[PDB]
Design an enzyme around this catalytic site. Structure first.
Site, mmCIF file in Angstrom:
data_model
loop_
_atom_site.group_PDB
_atom_site.id
_atom_site.type_symbol
_atom_site.label_atom_id
_atom_site.label_comp_id
_atom_site.label_asym_id
_atom_site.label_seq_id
_atom_site.Cartn_x
_atom_site.Cartn_y
_atom_site.Cartn_z
ATOM 1 N N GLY A 163 19.210 50.605 67.457
ATOM 2 C CA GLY A 163 19.307 51.161 66.129
ATOM 3 C C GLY A 163 20.527 50.796 65.309
ATOM 4 C CE1 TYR A 170 26.771 55.190 57.207
ATOM 5 C CE2 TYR A 170 27.827 56.962 58.407
ATOM 6 C CZ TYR A 170 27.146 55.772 58.395
ATOM 7 O OH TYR A 170 26.859 55.136 59.577
ATOM 8 C CG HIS A 181 35.597 53.184 64.171
ATOM 9 N ND1 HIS A 181 36.008 53.816 63.024
ATOM 10 C CD2 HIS A 181 34.560 52.388 63.810
ATOM 11 C CE1 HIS A 181 35.263 53.411 62.010
ATOM 12 N NE2 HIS A 181 34.378 52.533 62.459
ATOM 13 C CD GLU A 183 31.882 49.494 62.928
ATOM 14 O OE1 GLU A 183 30.763 49.929 62.657
ATOM 15 O OE2 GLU A 183 32.926 50.119 62.706
ATOM 16 C CG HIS A 269 37.256 49.918 60.577
ATOM 17 N ND1 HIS A 269 36.739 49.129 61.579
ATOM 18 C CD2 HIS A 269 36.242 50.720 60.168
ATOM 19 C CE1 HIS A 269 35.473 49.454 61.788
ATOM 20 N NE2 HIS A 269 35.138 50.413 60.937
ATOM 21 C CB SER A 281 27.306 51.221 56.617
ATOM 22 O OG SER A 281 27.069 52.310 57.481
HETATM 23 FE FE LIG Z 1 33.518 51.361 61.210
#
Ligand SMILES: [Fe+3]
Ligand SMILES: [Cl-]
Ligand SMILES: [Cl-]
Ligand SMILES: [Cl-]
Ligand SMILES: [Cl-]
Ligand SMILES: [Zn+2]
Length: 338
Positions: A163, A170, A181, A183, A269, A281
């Site tokens: 997924g 958001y 974090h 990704e 980031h 996103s």
């Molecule tokens: Fe991120």
């Protein structure tokens, strides 16, 4: 080459913009990836959605209230699930006196206010809503289907991407935090800010990622003892004042409505929203990612996390290394500039 590893802003013409995959390749050819984050401002004629008025009626089924604890640039966060609300209700909440953006002079001033008021009123966001709000037929930079190597193996080879290569919405308000974090699987990400108030971002060059980790480990030792990849929980906040103090290079930038931000493999980031907004996103990958995916440090403390098998990517795109790799003798150190 971008030897200062600073965050780059690109301004493509329509002609340059049309094809995402080609333009990303261009961006990396100018050293965009060294910063861990880059901004792309589309041409002014390009509009992914003609009218946003309808988005008011969308349901945020699981808004989250963010509870931040700490001081002096170091904080941990936990979440409380609130009742479902519409975007219209959420926006009205966000613009109320309790939750609205404070008065400020400029973006630097607001940045100071964010770090100074984190532990007062707890802000609320809506995240991980499956969907895209692009109009039908918009074929440029369509976050719903960027068609990268992630899609190639999913579709052609039946591999589950869990997924991460589908679109998420958001909804932010003032002071909503996204903690430090990289990704899932250290993939790339792309974020389009559809409407409303800006998002401020921090990014650390991938070549200094391990140094941020060591510092987080020092300041959050309990979180660290608990999970080998605890930062993946997205609950750890570290201010730029602390980063400067301990010699971690970073940069910041503010993303305005209508701008894309792209994060690069293993580019740590974080950031905060300035006020009510809406963003979309997804995650994606290129061939250059495969080497990061193969060494990505995963969350070892809850089974509900994203793990993608790297076998197919190595077999297909690194056939000269596949045997070596399956022997566990494909040992290398990544050159993050190249
Ligand atoms: Fe991120
Ligand atoms: Cl105020
Ligand atoms: Cl405030
Ligand atoms: Cl590629
Ligand atoms: Cl094959
Ligand atoms: Zn964990």
């Amino acid at each position: 080459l971008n030897p200062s590893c600073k965050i780059m802003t690109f301004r493509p013409s329509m002609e340059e913009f049309r094809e995402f995959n080609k333009y990303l390749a261009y961006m990396e050819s100018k050293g965009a990836h060294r910063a861990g984050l880059a901004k792309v401002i589309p041409p002014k004629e390009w509009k992914p959605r003609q009218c946003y008025d309808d988005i008011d009626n969308l349901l945020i089924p699981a808004p989250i209230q963010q509870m931040v604890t700490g001081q002096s640039g170091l904080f941990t966060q936990y979440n409380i699930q609130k009742k479902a609300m519409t975007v219209k209700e959420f926006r009205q909440l966000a613009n109320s006196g309790k939750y609205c953006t404070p008065r400020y002079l400029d973006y630097e001033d607001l940045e100071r206010k964010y770090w100074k008021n984190l532990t007062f009123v707890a802000p609320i966001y809506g995240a991980d809503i499956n969907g895209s709000i692009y109009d039908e037929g918009v074929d440029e930079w369509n976050i719903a289907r960027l068609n990268t190597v992630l899609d190639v193996v999913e579709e052609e080879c039946g591999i589950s991407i869990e997924g991460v290569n589908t679109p998420y919405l958001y909804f932010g308000m003032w002071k909503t935090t996204f903690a430090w974090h990289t990704e899932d699987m250290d993939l790339y990400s792309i974020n389009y800010l559809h409407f409303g108030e800006p998002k401020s971002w921090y990014a650390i060059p991938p070549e200094h990622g391990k140094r941020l980790e060591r510092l987080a480990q020092g300041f959050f030792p309990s979180s660290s003892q608990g999970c080998d990849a605890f930062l993946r929980h997205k609950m750890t906040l570290i201010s730029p004042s602390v980063l400067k103090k301990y010699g971690i290079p970073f940069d910041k930038i503010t993303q305005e409505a209508g701008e894309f931000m792209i994060t690069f493999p293993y580019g740590y980031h974080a950031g905060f929203n300035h006020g009510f907004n809406c963003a979309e996103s997804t995650n994606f990958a290129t061939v250059r990612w495969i080497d990061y995916g193969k060494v990505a440090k995963l969350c070892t403390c809850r089974k509900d996390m994203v793990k993608i098998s790297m076998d197919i990517f190595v077999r297909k795109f690194q056939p000269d290394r596949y045997q070596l790799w399956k022997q566990g003798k494909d040992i290398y150190t990544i050159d993050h500039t190249k």
